[PDB]
Write a protein that binds this ligand. Structure first.
Ligand SMILES: Nc1ncnc2c1ncn2[C@@H]1O[C@H](COP(=O)(O)OP(=O)(O)O)[C@@H](O)[C@H]1O
Lengths: 60, 577, 462, 124, 145
């Protein structure tokens, strides 16, 4: 019966670590797409001066 | 198209001038006959054509015509049940037209341009095709030989010829571009067939012996080497690997090897039976022979043609087994093309890029998922014939850094006729860890513990063999001595495969495991029975011991009925003492 | 930047190609070779005259001809564009990213061949490291900022010991007073001719133990062309010198299988007919192994470090082949895995008598590990060495003719080899390893232990 | 998951710089319609024959074979047309075997490294 | 030594070896072929029913087994005393001596194939039948006189 109780603890225990795994990983995924959208917000916010900088320094 | 004429003819190398612009490692027809040679060392406007065939009789002034391609094999349907020479031209058609001698510069197609194959497509017009996608299939012998788009080609299908029967040279799938796709395609041998990604091996390659699948296993995408001095087998084991495997096809490449080997394989294979499908065992093997007296420059390319054809059957999703025989004779060919080219050698004449070439050969193995998405693997077994025994070669060490399992044949243990001559001190295997899920699934639960016990008995017996030679072998106490007698029973029963017997030449995992269990039950109950106190002189003449020593001789189907009775006779035998 | 393109290639053979009427290439410059079908290869100028220039060629040489193949100059000194946002990436042997991610935006352009560090400006490597391997942490002590390689044989487990070290190597501030502040290790993992079977082992090992977020990987597989191994250790050490000495990391550099590198330059040095050392390796190879290995160590005034574990695969597993011979004349220590102990199932199969670490005496002792450390090491070597040379005497006279305080030697030896060396994948701290060493030394009679001072032999024996 | 966030950051950053660079190639290949370009092509031809002493010939797109011709008679150099060479002009040195390319495409793809550091610094 | 390039490079191309021995020569035995290092890598074809007499392969096998066992025990009888050895070992010593005095040392005569085989059975009748493991019992019944 101690073995049966160890197995039941193990089964609910598997479920515990797997639920924590899935919630935290999908959390980090949606924060990742938010960070991608943040730097794409920065992208067109200043892009013309960068094109102007390289388009001055590559020209003779 | 860059055409020139011969300037110098130094042995089997021809230096042609006038060839400004011909690329390196092209294939150029030399001579007025049209021999096949290959460019190395461009210099100024000058090639350096090594010719593959012999070169007696070429004058100066004969044309040398480049073809503008590197050495290409033709891959398509019609190769199985086929003996090909080094540059892939079918020797049976050479014997049809030429005679019974191999002459110089015969030109035949590797795949027969007249054969009718049934075509059954698997695409529609408008379907996209990419590299390595299947198009349709052809039933060859017992196979669904599935043709596949060349690995460079992409696009969309414009029109497909419907299901009939055709020829290899028939343009069967036209793209939306003007690209034809026939049933064959050519591939340069010094480039790898690409893969999508490479799985790690977790599945054994059942070699069908009893030492090389129990003690020193080798996985499916694995590389293994058999180094051995002469007269220690090394060819009977290559043939027992040719017959008794679980490979779906077998590419047996012999380069620089006895011709009687290849005619044994041609005569006795079409009357065997592969224990997987039925049908002749010759219907799955492609064998590329380049016998020792056939010209020495082609046994460089023979290895590459073998590994390319095995990769093609890999990309069709099989478990191919390539067996290179005498890679050291290949390395000798690299030496003779190097010293002809006047290089500065290193370590016994061999050019210093020896390990570069040999490493890139052995690297093409492995278990991958192909570009079509279906998985498949090619294993590689390489025979090494080092010169004087003397495993401290350059060829042996250069291959030893990169192969995964190592099988040392000793010729001292094959001069008292112990076959197979695989030493178990010196031979090792690195795939023994990753197969244990497969063993604990599919042969037993305690099979790793069991072969660990067998290897411990062999280590104890071999470390005790020194005092056995030193002082009297009757002058040792008897519980120690029982280790010696069970070591004798192991190495004269469990590692004693006959290979000429009709039922001992193949032993599956169940029968290997049964003989292991018999020996360990005998060992455990005799150790305990001598802890009780009995006579070791009486413990040996038990008639259950011949029942063990011939348990490797009963069939695979009449084994478990033999086995459970012998196990009960063990306990019934050690009650009565 | 304009691009000059030379042509007039005279000679292409093996690795080398030439270009005549080419004077404006610097020595040691990079070139890219541009064949007829539009494909860039890499190359590097190794000799310049007023007539010609000899280029060695990194990729393979198939498909080149002489009426095409323009040669274009790039990077008159060979550089690496180094950045700090580089610690999650893979690379191949030229630095080109092979994980699909975009190339990095170079904060600096470091020269790849390094500069010799100034022997005034070094610092004596002081601080202990522990590896959880007891043979290493007791008898051959590794300290931070140290070259020591792993000599191994054909088929021994050396990749597992190097991955085990890099998994669990930590620095102990409990025994030194530094304060915790614990910085773990960046790992620069360079690899030269690994097959797939070892690469899958290291990548599965790192992605399990959570190290691919701190490690930069320089993979040169064994089907990539066999000369960019000449660039790969310099790539890894330029990255390591950056990340250590300008961002205060504690970098650990794993240089896999230097035998492949040394054969990669035997190949080049015998395309040039350069007069060799012994067994074909060129006369200058000591300087190349020196210019790799001696880019390690700590700096006075900074917090960085570079610790090197190179790997060797000794050919006929001897210490007399030129590669282990020279590699031990440069570095400071080696640990030799022995083939004989491996067949006994012992893991990590180190044997202590042919292994050593020259910087033990800096970093062990009172105040920094424990006061009895060095003497325990001495006595273990003495006792185990005496046990081995009495095994060589067992090998003729039989076990019976040994007296006493000889059988305790003979039992010390194999109790040592199967309780101290043998361990699984467990991490034993320095207190565990020392108390196991005292447990093993307790078998000997107390009057025999003649290299241990009397206070330490009092307060630990038994 | 921290690896996932980091890889998202680096790929979005790289797509930003590739967008910048594609716009730059667009503005470069939209130079030769706007009449400041034949004022420019002479400057890079000038520096090319500066760095290449003994320059035997010039080869260019016939956009500026009629243009540079009188702007290169005083150069003492021959002029020829082999098009597909936009945005520049290259200098064939002594009897073949050495040639110097100067062109806006090549100047971009060979200055892009230091310009990537400085452009990413000005952008972020 | 076999590791010289002429023995080993012949040994790779050929189909076995027949090795004369120095030690059998000094005992006046002629032709001094010892049978332990020698073998034919072929000869499964060229023996047996029709091509030879029926019992050929098994007799050759049993001679090699018994002579190997006898030469091992007279290696060991040089070490241990020449009386501390059991009952069958005396017949193996007498078989090895009778073998190398009668079977090998043929001198000049041109033995037929049946004279060689009946000398083989004449030497195998110096052994108990339970010591004859490889020969299947039909040939034991017909021959073994
Ligand atoms: N054509 C060549 N290709 C490759 N290596 C060469 C070639 N010619 C010479 N070498 C090697 O380079 C060295 C050249 O030395 P040398 O020409 O005398 O002076 P320098 O050091 O100025 O080149 C020689 O030792 C030789 O080994």
């Amino acid at each position: 019966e101690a073995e049966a109780k160890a197995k039941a603890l193990e089964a609910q225990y598997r479920e515990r670590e797997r639920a924590e795994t899935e919630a935290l990983l999908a959390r980090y995924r949606e924060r990742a797409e938010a960070e991608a959208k943040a730097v794409r917000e920065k992208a067109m916010a200043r892009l013309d001066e960068a094109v102007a900088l390289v388009l001055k320094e590559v020209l003779p | 198209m860059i055409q020139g004429v011969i300037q110098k003819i130094a042995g089997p190398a021809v230096i042609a001038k006038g060839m400004l612009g011909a690329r390196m490692y092209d294939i150029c027809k030399v001579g007025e006959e049209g021999l096949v040679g290959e460019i190395i060392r461009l210099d100024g406007d000058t090639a350096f054509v090594q010719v593959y065939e012999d070169t007696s009789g070429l004058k100066v002034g004969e044309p040398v015509v480049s073809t503008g391609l590197p050495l290409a094999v033709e891959l398509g349907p019609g190769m199985l049940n086929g003996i090909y020479d080094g540059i892939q031209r079918p020797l049976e058609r050479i014997r049809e037209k030429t005679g019974i001698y191999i002459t110089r510069g015969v030109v035949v197609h590797a795949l027969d341009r007249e054969k009718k194959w049934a075509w059954t497509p698997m695409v529609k017009p408008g379907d996209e095709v990419r590299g390595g996608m299947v198009l349709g299939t052809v039933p060859e012998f017992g196979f669904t030989h599935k043709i596949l788009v060349p690995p460079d080609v992409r696009g969309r299908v414009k029109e497909v010829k419907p299901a009939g029967e055709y020829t290899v040279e028939e343009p069967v799938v036209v793209l939306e571009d003007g690209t034809e796709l026939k049933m064959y395609h050519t591939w340069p041998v010094r480039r790898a067939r690409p893969v999508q990604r490479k799985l790690d091996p977790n599945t054994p390659f059942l070699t069908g012996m009893r030492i090389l699948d129990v003690l020193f296993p080798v996985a499916m995408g694995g590389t293994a080497a058999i180094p051995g001095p002469f007269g220690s087998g090394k060819t009977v084991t290559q043939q027992s690997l040719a017959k008794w495997s679980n490979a779906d096809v077998v590419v047996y490449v012999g380069c620089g090897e006895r011709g009687n080997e290849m005619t044994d394989v041609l005569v006795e294979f079409p009357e065997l039976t592969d224990p997987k499908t039925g049908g002749p065992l010759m219907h799955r093997t492609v064998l590329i022979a380049n016998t020792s007296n056939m010209p020495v420059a082609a046994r460089e390319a023979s290895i590459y043609v073998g590994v390319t054809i095995a990769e093609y059957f890999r990309d069709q999703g099989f478990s191919v087994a390539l067996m290179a025989d005498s890679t050291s004779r290949w390395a000798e060919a690299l030496r003779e093309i190097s010293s002809r080219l006047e290089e500065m050698p290193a370590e016994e004449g061999y050019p210093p890029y020896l390990a570069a070439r040999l490493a890139a050969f052995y690297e093409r193995a492995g278990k991958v998922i192909t570009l079509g998405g279906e998985e498949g693997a090619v294993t590689i077994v390489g025979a090494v014939s080092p010169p004087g025994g003397d495993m401290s070669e350059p060829v042996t060490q250069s291959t030893l850094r990169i192969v995964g399992a190592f099988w040392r044949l000793d010729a001292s243990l094959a001069f008292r006729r112990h076959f197979p001559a695989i030493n178990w001190n010196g031979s090792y295997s690195l795939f023994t860890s990753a197969l244990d899920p497969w063993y604990r699934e599919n042969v037993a639960e305690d099979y790793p513990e069991l072969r660990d016990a067998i290897s411990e008995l062999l280590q104890r017996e071999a470390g005790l063999q020194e005092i056995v030679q030193l002082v009297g072998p009757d002058a040792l106490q008897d519980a120690e001595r029982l280790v010696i007698e069970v070591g004798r029973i192991i190495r004269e029963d469990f590692l004693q495969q006959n290979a000429y017997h009709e039922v001992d030449a193949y032993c599956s995992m169940k029968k290997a495991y049964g003989i292991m269990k018999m020996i360990l039950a005998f060992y455990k109950e005799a150790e305990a029975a001598i802890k009780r106190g009995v006579s070791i002189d009486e413990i040996l003449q038990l008639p259950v011991l011949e029942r063990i020593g011939r348990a490797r001789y009963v069939s695979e189907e009449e084994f478990p009925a033999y086995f459970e009775e012998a196990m009960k006779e063990i306990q019934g035998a050690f009650k009565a003492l | 930047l304009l691009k000059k393109e030379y042509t007039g290639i005279t000679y292409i053979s093996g690795p080398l190609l030439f270009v005549e009427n080419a004077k404006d290439l610097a020595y040691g410059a990079i070139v890219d070779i541009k064949d007829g079908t539009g494909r860039v290869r890499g190359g590097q100028v190794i000799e310049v005259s007023e007539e010609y220039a000899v280029i060695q060629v990194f990729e393979e040489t198939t498909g080149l001809d002489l009426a095409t193949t323009s040669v274009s100059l790039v990077e008159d000194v060979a550089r690496l564009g180094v950045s700090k946002e580089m610690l999650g990436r893979r690379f191949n042997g030229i630095g080109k990213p092979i994980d699909g991610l975009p190339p990095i935006t170079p904060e600096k352009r470091l020269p790849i061949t390094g500069l010799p560090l100034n022997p005034v400006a070094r610092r004596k490597p002081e601080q202990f490291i522990q590896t959880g391997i007891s043979t290493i942490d007791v008898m051959n002590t590794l300290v931070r900022g140290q070259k020591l390689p792993i000599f191994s044989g054909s088929g021994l487990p050396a990749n597992e010991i190097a991955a085990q070290i890099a998994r669990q190597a930590t620095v102990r501030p409990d025994l030194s007073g530094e304060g915790e502040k614990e910085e773990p290790f960046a790992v620069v993992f360079a690899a030269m001719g690994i097959t797939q079977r070892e690469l899958s082992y290291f990548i599965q090992e790192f992605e399990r133990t959570g190290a691919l977020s701190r490690s930069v990987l320089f993979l040169n597989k064994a089907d990539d062309p066999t000369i960019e191994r000449i660039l790969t250790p310099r790539m890894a050490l330029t990255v390591a010198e950056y990340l250590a000495f300008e961002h205060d990391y504690h970098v650990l550099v794993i240089l896999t299988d230097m035998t492949n590198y040394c054969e990669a330059l035997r190949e080049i040095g015998a395309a040039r007919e350069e007069i060799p050392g012994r067994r074909g390796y060129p006369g200058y190879m000591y300087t190349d192994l020196a210019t790799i290995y001696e880019r390690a160590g700590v700096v006075e005034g900074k917090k960085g470090s570079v610790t090197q574990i190179p790997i060797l695969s000794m050919p006929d597993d001897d210490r007399t082949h030129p590669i282990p011979d020279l590699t031990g004349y440069i570095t400071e220590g080696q640990i030799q895995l022995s083939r004989e102990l491996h067949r006994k199932g012992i893991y990590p199969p180190i044997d202590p008598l042919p292994s050593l670490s020259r910087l033990m005496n800096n970093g062990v002792g009172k105040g920094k590990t424990r006061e009895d450390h060095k003497q325990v090491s001495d006595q273990l070597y003495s006792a185990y060495a005496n046990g081995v040379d009495i095994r060589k005497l067992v090998a003729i006279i039989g076990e019976d003719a040994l007296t006493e305080n000889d059988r305790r030697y003979l039992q010390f030896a194999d109790a040592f080899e199967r309780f101290f060396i043998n361990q699984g994948q467990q991490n034993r701290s320095i207190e565990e390893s020392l108390q196991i060493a005292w447990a093993l030394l307790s078998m000997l009679p107390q009057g025999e232990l003649k290299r241990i001072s009397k206070d330490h032999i009092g307060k630990y024996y038994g | 998951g921290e690896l996932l966030v980091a890889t998202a950051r680096t790929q979005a950053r790289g797509e930003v710089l590739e967008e910048v660079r594609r716009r730059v190639r667009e503005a470069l290949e939209a130079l030769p319609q706007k009449p400041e370009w034949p004022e420019v092509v002479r400057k890079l031809a000038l520096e090319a024959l500066e760095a290449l002493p003994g320059a035997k010939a010039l080869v260019a797109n016939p956009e500026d074979l009629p243009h540079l011709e009188a702007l290169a008679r005083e150069r003492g150099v021959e002029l020829q047309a082999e098009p597909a060479l936009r945005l520049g002009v290259r200098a064939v040195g002594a009897e073949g075997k050495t040639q110097v390319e100067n062109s806006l495409l090549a100047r971009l793809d060979r200055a892009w490294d230091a310009l990537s550091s400085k452009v990413a610094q000005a952008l972020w």
